[PDB]
Enzyme design. Sequence first.
Site, PDB file in Angstrom:
ATOM      1  N   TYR A  96      -4.735  10.592   9.095  1.00 36.80           N
ATOM      2  CA  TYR A  96      -5.534  10.762   7.940  1.00 36.80           C
ATOM      3  C   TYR A  96      -4.946  10.410   6.461  1.00 36.80           C
ATOM      4  O   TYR A  96      -3.884  11.024   6.288  1.00 36.80           O
ATOM      5  CB  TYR A  96      -6.213  11.972   7.611  1.00 36.80           C
ATOM      6  CG  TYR A  96      -7.417  12.059   6.373  1.00 36.80           C
ATOM      7  CD1 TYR A  96      -8.339  11.174   6.272  1.00 36.80           C
ATOM      8  CD2 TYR A  96      -7.111  13.094   5.606  1.00 36.80           C
ATOM      9  CE1 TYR A  96      -9.324  11.332   5.323  1.00 36.80           C
ATOM     10  CE2 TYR A  96      -7.899  13.378   4.493  1.00 36.80           C
ATOM     11  CZ  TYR A  96      -8.899  12.508   4.338  1.00 36.80           C
ATOM     12  OH  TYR A  96      -9.806  12.690   3.169  1.00 36.80           O
ATOM     13  N   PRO A  99      -3.804  11.718  -0.776  1.00 38.48           N
ATOM     14  CA  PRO A  99      -3.013  12.245  -1.502  1.00 38.48           C
ATOM     15  C   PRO A  99      -2.264  13.539  -1.214  1.00 38.48           C
ATOM     16  O   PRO A  99      -0.963  13.877  -1.689  1.00 38.48           O
ATOM     17  CB  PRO A  99      -3.379  12.055  -2.846  1.00 38.48           C
ATOM     18  CG  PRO A  99      -4.627  11.590  -2.715  1.00 38.48           C
ATOM     19  CD  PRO A  99      -5.156  11.686  -1.376  1.00 38.48           C
ATOM     20  N   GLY A 123     -11.026   8.077   4.456  1.00 40.52           N
ATOM     21  CA  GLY A 123     -11.962   8.899   3.550  1.00 40.52           C
ATOM     22  C   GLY A 123     -12.684   8.322   2.348  1.00 40.52           C
ATOM     23  O   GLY A 123     -11.920   7.255   1.854  1.00 40.52           O
ATOM     24  N   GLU A 126     -15.459  12.496  -2.015  1.00 37.27           N
ATOM     25  CA  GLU A 126     -14.284  13.635  -2.142  1.00 37.27           C
ATOM     26  C   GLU A 126     -13.592  13.988  -1.183  1.00 37.27           C
ATOM     27  O   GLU A 126     -12.491  14.635  -1.527  1.00 37.27           O
ATOM     28  CB  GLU A 126     -15.014  14.966  -2.945  1.00 37.27           C
ATOM     29  CG  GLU A 126     -15.849  14.637  -4.105  1.00 37.27           C
ATOM     30  CD  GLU A 126     -15.355  13.750  -5.201  1.00 37.27           C
ATOM     31  OE1 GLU A 126     -14.217  14.041  -5.691  1.00 37.27           O
ATOM     32  OE2 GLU A 126     -15.699  12.593  -5.367  1.00 37.27           O
ATOM     33  N   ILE A 143       0.466   7.171   0.773  1.00 39.37           N
ATOM     34  CA  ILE A 143       1.172   5.913   0.311  1.00 39.37           C
ATOM     35  C   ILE A 143       1.833   5.821  -0.995  1.00 39.37           C
ATOM     36  O   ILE A 143       2.726   5.292  -1.414  1.00 39.37           O
ATOM     37  CB  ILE A 143       0.465   4.502   0.145  1.00 39.37           C
ATOM     38  CG1 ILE A 143      -1.011   4.404  -0.514  1.00 39.37           C
ATOM     39  CG2 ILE A 143      -0.272   4.313   1.673  1.00 39.37           C
ATOM     40  CD1 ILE A 143      -1.229   3.138  -0.796  1.00 39.37           C
ATOM     41  N   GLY A 144       1.426   7.047  -1.741  1.00 38.70           N
ATOM     42  CA  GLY A 144       2.049   7.277  -3.100  1.00 38.70           C
ATOM     43  C   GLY A 144       1.106   8.249  -4.087  1.00 38.70           C
ATOM     44  O   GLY A 144       0.020   8.544  -3.600  1.00 38.70           O
ATOM     45  N   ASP A 145       1.905   8.628  -5.130  1.00 42.24           N
ATOM     46  CA  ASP A 145       0.980   9.797  -5.750  1.00 42.24           C
ATOM     47  C   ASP A 145       0.334   9.149  -6.814  1.00 42.24           C
ATOM     48  O   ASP A 145       0.286   9.301  -8.150  1.00 42.24           O
ATOM     49  CB  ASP A 145       2.086  10.696  -6.501  1.00 42.24           C
ATOM     50  CG  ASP A 145       3.018  11.555  -5.510  1.00 42.24           C
ATOM     51  OD1 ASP A 145       2.476  12.165  -4.588  1.00 42.24           O
ATOM     52  OD2 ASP A 145       3.912  12.060  -5.654  1.00 42.24           O
ATOM     53  N   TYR A 146      -0.903   8.618  -6.255  1.00 37.58           N
ATOM     54  CA  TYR A 146      -2.017   8.212  -7.056  1.00 37.58           C
ATOM     55  C   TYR A 146      -3.347   7.914  -6.211  1.00 37.58           C
ATOM     56  O   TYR A 146      -3.288   8.431  -5.238  1.00 37.58           O
ATOM     57  CB  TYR A 146      -1.791   6.767  -7.417  1.00 37.58           C
ATOM     58  CG  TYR A 146      -0.878   5.697  -6.709  1.00 37.58           C
ATOM     59  CD1 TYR A 146      -1.757   5.238  -5.528  1.00 37.58           C
ATOM     60  CD2 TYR A 146       0.214   5.598  -6.493  1.00 37.58           C
ATOM     61  CE1 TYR A 146      -1.031   4.390  -4.689  1.00 37.58           C
ATOM     62  CE2 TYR A 146       0.927   4.941  -5.585  1.00 37.58           C
ATOM     63  CZ  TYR A 146       0.265   4.381  -4.542  1.00 37.58           C
ATOM     64  OH  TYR A 146       0.887   3.572  -3.573  1.00 37.58           O
ATOM     65  N   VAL A 147      -4.271   8.163  -7.026  1.00 38.86           N
ATOM     66  CA  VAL A 147      -5.788   8.337  -6.500  1.00 38.86           C
ATOM     67  C   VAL A 147      -6.480   7.155  -6.486  1.00 38.86           C
ATOM     68  O   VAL A 147      -6.464   6.337  -7.203  1.00 38.86           O
ATOM     69  CB  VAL A 147      -6.463   9.535  -7.174  1.00 38.86           C
ATOM     70  CG1 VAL A 147      -7.942   9.633  -6.417  1.00 38.86           C
ATOM     71  CG2 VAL A 147      -5.638  10.702  -7.280  1.00 38.86           C
ATOM     72  N   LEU A 148      -6.903   6.959  -5.349  1.00 38.29           N
ATOM     73  CA  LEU A 148      -7.777   5.589  -5.086  1.00 38.29           C
ATOM     74  C   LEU A 148      -9.214   5.982  -4.708  1.00 38.29           C
ATOM     75  O   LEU A 148      -9.568   6.886  -4.926  1.00 38.29           O
ATOM     76  CB  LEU A 148      -7.065   4.628  -3.987  1.00 38.29           C
ATOM     77  CG  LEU A 148      -5.483   4.355  -4.189  1.00 38.29           C
ATOM     78  CD1 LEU A 148      -5.043   3.933  -2.933  1.00 38.29           C
ATOM     79  CD2 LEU A 148      -5.356   3.566  -5.431  1.00 38.29           C
ATOM     80  N   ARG A 164       5.291  -5.276  10.395  1.00 36.86           N
ATOM     81  CA  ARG A 164       6.384  -5.824  10.290  1.00 36.86           C
ATOM     82  C   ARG A 164       7.667  -5.257  11.335  1.00 36.86           C
ATOM     83  O   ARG A 164       8.490  -6.294  11.671  1.00 36.86           O
ATOM     84  CB  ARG A 164       6.963  -5.529   8.992  1.00 36.86           C
ATOM     85  CG  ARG A 164       6.162  -6.106   7.823  1.00 36.86           C
ATOM     86  CD  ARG A 164       6.743  -6.213   6.591  1.00 36.86           C
ATOM     87  NE  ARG A 164       8.224  -6.852   6.339  1.00 36.86           N
ATOM     88  CZ  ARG A 164       9.406  -6.123   6.400  1.00 36.86           C
ATOM     89  NH1 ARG A 164       9.290  -4.801   6.564  1.00 36.86           N
ATOM     90  NH2 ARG A 164      10.680  -6.661   6.085  1.00 36.86           N
ATOM     91  N   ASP A 174      16.382  -5.639   7.402  1.00 39.48           N
ATOM     92  CA  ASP A 174      15.924  -6.026   6.027  1.00 39.48           C
ATOM     93  C   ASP A 174      17.172  -5.889   5.175  1.00 39.48           C
ATOM     94  O   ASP A 174      18.356  -5.696   5.759  1.00 39.48           O
ATOM     95  CB  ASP A 174      14.785  -5.224   5.401  1.00 39.48           C
ATOM     96  CG  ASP A 174      13.837  -6.199   4.594  1.00 39.48           C
ATOM     97  OD1 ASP A 174      13.290  -7.190   5.006  1.00 39.48           O
ATOM     98  OD2 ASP A 174      14.000  -5.824   3.496  1.00 39.48           O
TER      99      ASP A 174
END
Lengths: 250, 250
Positions: A96, A99, A123, A126, A143-148, A164, A174
């Site tokens: 799942y 954040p 999801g 809310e 994926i990161g400290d932000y809300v999509l 990859r 790499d």
Amino acid sequence: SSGLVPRGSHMWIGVISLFPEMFKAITEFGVTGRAVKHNLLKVECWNPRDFTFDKHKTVDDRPYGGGPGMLMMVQPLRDAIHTAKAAAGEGAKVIYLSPQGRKLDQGGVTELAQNQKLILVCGRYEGIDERLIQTEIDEEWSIGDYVLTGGELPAMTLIDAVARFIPGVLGEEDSFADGLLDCPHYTRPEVLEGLTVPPVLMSGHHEEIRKWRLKQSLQRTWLRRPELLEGLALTDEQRKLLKEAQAEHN
Amino acid sequence: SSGLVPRGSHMWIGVISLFPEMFKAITEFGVTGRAVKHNLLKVECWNPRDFTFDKHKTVDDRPYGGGPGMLMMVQPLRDAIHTAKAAAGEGAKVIYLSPQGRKLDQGGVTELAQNQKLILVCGRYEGIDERLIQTEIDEEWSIGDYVLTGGELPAMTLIDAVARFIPGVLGEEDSFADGLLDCPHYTRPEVLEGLTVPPVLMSGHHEEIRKWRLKQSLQRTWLRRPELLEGLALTDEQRKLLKEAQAEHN
Ligand SMILES: NC(=O)c1cnc2c(ccn2CC(=O)NC2CCNCC2)c1
Ligand SMILES: NC(=O)c1cnc2c(ccn2CC(=O)NC2CCNCC2)c1
């Protein structure tokens, strides 16, 4: 399925999404698109809307306790998950994206890439009922400290990142695999807005070019992301080149 | 452009991409798709391939110094950037997504969301010539410490994240806006695989429900992401609820 491309480590990714069409952005284009055409990666989508029974194919539901938003409706979402788990057979980890999950980084990509099967739950609104996280989800990742607006872009991001690591997808171990930022890269022309290409890169001297690249990777990591250095046990060569860059900076 | 939806803070996002079709995943679907239909968000794409002049529309080029990969060719990419900057007029910040950039987080989303115009440059292959970063790029940003096949998914991620700050896009000053992880959410049914909804959320008691939510947000942040607490100056109410959760845990 059939084809000549070696697919020993082929990956199967089940996706649960109200907007499966978004996933065309990775299945039809570039490196991921070629992975899907060559049978190295399979991405198979289920849409909760297809598991509804009401006339208006309802996929959201009201939260217990009020609050302004809606949640994904449990029955359609649970049914979709169950269908994906029956398609995947045994050994599929269910993820799942949110954040509240474990923060994704390249080491965690390579951990996830060890799974031949994954199911990614996207999801919307809310989020999802907590009891489905408890009963149906193996791991929660961010994926990161932000809300999509939903978990599709995270899921696509994680698909691309793991893809990859599938052998044959690239044309990997790499530079970022050293835990360092990449060095500067230069192509034609030799002079651009009066900025020249570092002479070493024209020198044909393969070892001095390797050293210069590694020294720039160490300098850039130190200047931009010094906390990434603390994670590393530098090689003797790395310690020397970092010390050289820090003296040149000063 | 025309319409009844208030668009005072409308955002214009120029994108430079070899795969503009990927951006259908945010322009045609969900909350972002409705933002574009209502003229709150405009996303306009330029493809370096359209700025080529050779018979095979070449967009990659060999790196100075060798190394196994290619770089984006400078002339097509520079020309595309210049076209996008002339379309945007004055005040457009040009952003390059890469793992060498500043790490995106919700505060940095809200910083970027202050720009009415942005241009997002999507790198493919081993990246772009450093002198274009120096001459054409205002800021470099990362979505996270992982490597993808190109900058499209990062750019879409940043579009989606900033779009949420455009007034009217949502149906914001969120929970994650407190710098805390979200609380658990529950919908129908009242009992699921023998797991019940917390009685408080059925109580109709609006203040006890607010307190319980905030206490779960504090407990979850403490247990999962304790470093996020160190960033915060907790309110007196927050300090009390966190202390209560930590005593219940112990
Ligand atoms: N960072 C991620 O991996 C991420 C971000 N947002 C995501 C996901 C998956 C879904 N969404 C939407 C979401 O969770 N929104 C809610 C945030 C808390 N308050 C209610 C809205 C991943
Ligand atoms: N994390 C990001 O925001 C991100 C990740 N990858 C991206 C971008 C934008 C492009 N790519 C591809 C890339 O940079 N690949 C190179 C990494 C260093 N070695 C050569 C391959 C953003």
